[PDB]
């Protein structure tokens, strides 16, 4: 039998939420920016030998629609919190996401993975160690990714599934 997982992809504008999702769903990358309003996807994968149906909600980085964003967080089971490794502000934004998710879901243990994207680029401003230390303080996994090269893409989403599965048991 199958298991289904409701994943929600959040993070600041332009960090690569959609590029990550499209690499997972469609196996390609383009440099063109297509700004998100809202998109949803479904994909069947095998994780840890078990068949998994992934529901992916790709949200916009825009933060001014609290009523809708709260319902994303109520419904979602796990959250991919994305920043870009060459955007320090996007890394500073991360704790706001964790705070909002804990608030809306009324829990300090929500399935969450920290994702440092665009690791292919030569313009890093956020040290891996800084992000590793922040994920440790949260007790959550940290994964560096590149939607362009596909580095870490499967790992980031599949780790999130594993965090949900662990939490549910």
């Amino acid at each position: 039998s199958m298991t289904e997982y409701k994943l929600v992809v959040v993070g600041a504008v332009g960090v690569g939420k959609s590029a990550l999702t499209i690499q997972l769903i469609q196996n390609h990358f383009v440099d063109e920016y297509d700004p998100t309003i809202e998109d949803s996807y479904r994909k069947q994968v095998v994780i840890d030998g078990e068949t998994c149906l992934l529901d992916i909600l790709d949200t916009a980085g825009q933060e001014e629609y609290s009523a809708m964003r709260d319902q994303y967080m109520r419904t979602g089971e796990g959250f991919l919190c994305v920043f870009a490794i060459n955007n320090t502000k996007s890394f500073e934004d991360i704790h706001h996401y964790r705070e909002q998710i804990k608030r809306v879901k009324d829990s300090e243990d929500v399935p969450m993975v920290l994702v440092g994207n665009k690791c292919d680029l030569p313009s890093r401003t956020v040290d891996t160690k800084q992000a590793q230390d922040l994920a440790r303080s949260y007790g959550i996994p940290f994964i560096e990714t590149s939607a362009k090269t596909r580095q870490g893409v499967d790992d980031a989403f599949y780790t999130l599934v594993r965090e949900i599965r662990k939490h549910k048991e």
């Binding site: 504008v13 297509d34 309003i37 998109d39 629609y65």
Partner: protein
């Protein structure tokens, strides 16, 4: 106050004309950018560009004539200009307001409300309203969707200044 027009096309077929009153009396700098982009007189402007995001029950957004993909646009003053004022509010259908990416990032992208959008007050500069052709804007919604992608190419086939 100047009046400008858009002749709206759907995959190149005429839909109809939308005309706008531009509130130069209250928002002169923002009204003048839109007027001039509508005549093309600076050598660039709205003619040929598309409405890339049409969300029924909220708004029709367009104005990216530089990247042609909803990311671009520019003003007659440079790439961006500051928020001029927030005197006018998004009070209902027909309001014409500037799109932006945060404070003081006005370029050429704009939106026409199809309902009241009061949560945008104080964040987007209102500077005009539909005069004639609200039935054309309503007809544009057939081609939108919840995430704003359009099922046909909705373009400003022609535009200019009236009266």
């Amino acid at each position: 106050n100047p009046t400008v027009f858009f002749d709206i096309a759907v995959d190149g077929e005429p839909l109809g004309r939308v005309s706008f009153e531009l509130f130069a009396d209250k928002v002169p700098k923002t009204a003048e950018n839109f007027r001039a982009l509508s005549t093309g007189e600076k050598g660039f402007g709205y003619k040929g560009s598309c409405f890339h995001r049409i969300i029924p029950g909220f708004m029709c957004q367009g104005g990216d004539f530089t990247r042609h993909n909803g990311t671009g646009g520019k003003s007659i003053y440079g790439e961006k200009f500051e928020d001029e004022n927030f005197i006018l509010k998004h009070t209902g259908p027909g309001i014409l307001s500037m799109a932006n990416a945060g404070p003081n990032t006005n370029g050429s992208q704009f939106f026409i409300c199809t309902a009241k959008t009061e949560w945008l007050d104080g964040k987007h500069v209102v500077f005009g309203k539909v005069k004639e052709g609200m039935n054309i804007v309503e007809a544009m919604e057939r081609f939108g969707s919840r995430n704003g992608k359009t099922s046909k190419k909705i373009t400003i086939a022609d535009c200019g200044q009236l009266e």
